[PDB]
Amino acid sequence: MGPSLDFALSLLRRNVRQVQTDQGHFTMLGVRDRLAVLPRHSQPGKTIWIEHKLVNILDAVELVDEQGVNLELTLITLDTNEKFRDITKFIPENISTASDATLVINTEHMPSMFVPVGDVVQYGFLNLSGKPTHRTMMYNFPTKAGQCGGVVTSVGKVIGIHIGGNGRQGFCAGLKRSYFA
């Protein structure tokens, strides 16, 4: 088994969780320890359904710019026995484009789903909420509903979290290592 399949299947085994909130079904990324990341529009409450179990949320942080602009990412701290495999080494220090990325989706309705989104290129500012959102990237792939929170990966790197699309393109909130220090 080659290294991209193995890396992506490992992500699904250890870091990429099927979750539910009042807003619906999402893909969640566990980053390290009890820290995970979700798309801001999942709006997690005081608790969250993770795969088989209701899990208590100890803290939730909606990430913003040095200028107070929305990054569309919510950091959640979970009341869990589990400590996530630390994957912060695979997250670039700065927001990184990529060639031939795979979007990894994990939801009850779309389990263990692999979508080749192609090249991921710099996009910057986006209208989502609609509220201004910064540090977005874009892939020329018609991403569907239900894929929000899906993990943008290429060659051992985890570079984004899927936050929506326009029927023709998909957009991710860029990841950088410092969000998770």
Side-chain angles (χ1 to χ4, degrees):
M1 180 185 294
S4 310
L5 192 52
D6 176 74
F7 176 85
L9 291 166
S10 281
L11 278 182
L12 277 170
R13 260 187 324 113
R14 296 160 91 144
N15 298 83
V16 184
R17 299 284 176 250
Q18 299 174 6
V19 306
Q20 277 177 253
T21 66
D22 291 347
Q23 292 316 109
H25 283 80
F26 294 95
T27 297
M28 185 190 68
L29 185 69
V31 169
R32 53 158 188 75
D33 303 307
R34 282 132 191 128
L35 187 66
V37 64
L38 287 156
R40 192 207 151 278
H41 63 264
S42 58
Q43 282 158 86
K46 284 1 177 172
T47 67
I48 188 176
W49 185 261
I50 309 182
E51 252 147 32
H52 64 275
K53 169 169 83 180
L54 199 61
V55 179
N56 174 12
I57 287 169
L58 292 178
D59 183 50
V61 173
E62 299 198 355
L63 285 185
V64 301
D65 244 5
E66 66 183 55
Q67 279 230 49
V69 177
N70 172 62
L71 300 163
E72 198 55 28
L73 296 156
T74 301
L75 265 49
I76 59 173
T77 298
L78 303 168
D79 177 19
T80 196
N81 282 123
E82 140 154 62
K83 174 179 100 345
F84 291 112
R85 182 185 65 196
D86 183 349
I87 55 164
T88 56
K89 69 174 126 278
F90 306 127
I91 297 179
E93 303 197 351
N94 293 290
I95 288 161
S96 311
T97 67
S99 300
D100 261 27
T102 303
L103 180 51
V104 187
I105 299 311
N106 200 25
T107 259
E108 152 160 63
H109 294 338
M110 297 175 166
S112 291
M113 180 191 188
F114 287 29
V115 180
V117 288
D119 293 1
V120 175
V121 306
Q122 223 86 85
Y123 206 87
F125 162 113
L126 185 71
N127 332 53
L128 176 110
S129 288
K131 28 196 163 231
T133 306
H134 282 159
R135 298 176 192 176
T136 71
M137 286 187 292
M138 169 290 290
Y139 11 106
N140 292 132
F141 192 97
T143 54
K144 295 206 146 151
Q147 306 187 311
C148 296
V151 177
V152 190
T153 71
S154 136
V155 304
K157 275 156 299 191
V158 171
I159 68 166
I161 290 294
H162 192 265
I163 57 167
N166 57 26
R168 278 299 113 196
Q169 298 172 304
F171 301 90
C172 68
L175 300 178
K176 80 206 272 210
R177 194 175 295 160
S178 63
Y179 291 165
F180 312 106

